[PDB]
Symmetry: C3
Subunit: 113 residues, 3 copies
């Protein structure tokens, strides 16, 4: 999995260790080795959710497999829970877009999977 | 709908009301309540379009439904009009990628929409 | 093609000329006219790959066609090569997501490519 979070919360509100936590938690959640997990957090964004500037986030999770109805519910609980606990973003102000990528459509290490 | 715009226009050129205008216009275009609608503008970007650094935008619109050939042709007029007036970007320097998301593939409020 | 690179490499490490080089190399790779090619580089990102903050990149290539198994392998060799040479990012710390977009799902100048 690769996980990207874009948020209006300020950089100083991102706690030390957040990218490590996301790595660890995504490894546990997907069963994938941490080596392949990428995480990207983008604070201080100009965004709104429902016409309001209260803390919010727009996220994506891309994986080659491990995407589906129940799995995505579980990921959303995990990830909305982290954004709430760690970044003080209400879960009802987060969207997470999930992508099940074909291996042939993911480049890595000079080739594709 | 959620709408993201990445642009090389400077932050000071993005009007304070732009996110709210987009929110409202997208609600009217899609018939969705504005509470559901998220908007994100990312200025000051290092970008080129056609090998030029003149103002440009790379955008996305994600929706669960309300995406399709005719609807997308309409949205492009709406969105190019807003980017042209408010960000001074020529409409031929804008791409918008449209994504019709399955409900099971959109997380919100600790769960998905499925 | 439109190519976007998100990286933790700092802005000062991005060579002058990098966006032009990408535009030119993508035109050669895809056979598309440079008029339609867009490139976008985002340095200074808060990023980790494999739990490490060593240089890494998350990238995307969107095209209407010209996406497929062998083609994508070639693009990845090209693009990882450029990121290694110019940004000093190891290839094994790069992901490139490829998207073969339906022409109806790509907005441009007040209409879609359909
Ligand atoms: S393993 C976890 N993520 C690998 C990946 C990268 C792009 C799609 O899936
Ligand atoms: S309602 C408008 N947007 C909701 C949404 C978020 C992601 C895909 O669709
Ligand atoms: S031509 C190269 N890119 C055009 C494009 C933009 C979005 C999908 O394809």
């Amino acid at each position: 999995p690769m996980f990207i979070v874009n948020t209006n919360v300020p950089r100083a509100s991102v706690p030390d260790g957040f990218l490590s936590e996301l790595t660890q938690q995504l490894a546990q959640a997907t069963g994938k080795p941490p080596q392949y997990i990428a995480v990207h957090v983008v604070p201080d964004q100009l965004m709104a959710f429902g016409g309001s500037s209260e803390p919010c986030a727009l996220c994506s999770l891309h994986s080659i497999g491990k995407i589906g109805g129940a799995q995505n519910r579980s990921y959303s609980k995990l990830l909305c829970g982290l954004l709430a606990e760690r970044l003080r973003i209400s879960p009802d102000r987060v969207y997470i877009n999930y992508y099940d990528m074909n291996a042939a459509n993911v480049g890595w290490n000079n080739s594709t999977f």
